[PDB]
């Protein structure tokens, strides 16, 4: 019924270019928060902080989308493993009771935007831009994704499909 899905602005990229991965939730009822683990290929790509215009550090938060923007103590978490190509981040409405009480649930929209800079010519066959998959601190999750509702419940992993990012190609 629900989905995690993504989209890019361009799939043909030259070295030096930036490709932005927008990550959406779709029909996640009363969505309150998410955490992702996202593996990328460190030979070809480097995560780029488009807000600070510099490389990620291990604490860098991706750009926001439209969800989780309300004043319900919206809080970020991030701890990457950049040497190994693993992004680990999430955001949540910490004040669940107030969010719940708003009677204005979110369920569909962009939750984050992760930009990669191409640092080596992309192979001719293409590469997957990134993959959602469990790192060591999401050992209990399915496909690198945890979603939650405004009761603070884990939104069950059989209620939604994670749609993996597709390929990028050299210009």
């Amino acid at each position: 019924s629900g989905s995690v899905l993504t989209a890019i602005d361009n799939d043909k990229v030259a070295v030096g270019d930036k490709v932005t991965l927008t990550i959406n939730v779709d029909k996640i009822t009363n969505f309150s928060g998410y955490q992702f683990n996202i593996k990328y290929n460190t030979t070809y790509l480097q995560p780029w902080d488009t807000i600070a215009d510099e490389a990620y550090t291990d604490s860098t938060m991706p750009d926001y989308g439209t969800l989780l923007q309300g004043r319900f103590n919206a809080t970020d978490m991030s701890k990457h493993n950049l040497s190994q190509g693993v992004l680990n981040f999430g955001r949540l409405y910490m004040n669940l009771s107030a969010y719940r009480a708003s009677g204005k649930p979110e369920s569909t929209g962009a939750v984050a935007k992760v930009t990669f800079k191409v640092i080596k010519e992309i192979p001719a066959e293409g590469i997957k831009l990134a993959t959602f998959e469990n790192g060591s601190s999401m050992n209990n999750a399915v496909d690198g994704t945890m979603l939650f509702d405004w009761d603070g419940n884990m939104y069950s992993s059989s209620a939604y499909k994670v749609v993996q990012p597709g390929l990028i190609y050299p210009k």
Binding site: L96, S137, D151, G152
Partner: protein, 49 residues
């Protein structure tokens, strides 16, 4: 279990969003649990035993 990492609220050996959601569930219920506790929890975010 024997290992109880600081911030491991559900005792699974890892610090992730499921732990933060336990803070969250109690938000508004140093004597309180609020956004100062989250800052500390975020120090530990991602740690595994």
């Amino acid at each position: 279990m024997f290992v109880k990492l600081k911030g491991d609220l559900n005792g699974d050996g890892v610090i992730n969003m499921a732990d933060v959601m336990i803070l969250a569930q109690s938000f508004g219920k140093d004597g309180v649990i609020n956004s100062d506790d989250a800052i500390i929890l975020a120090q530990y975010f991602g740690k595994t035993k």
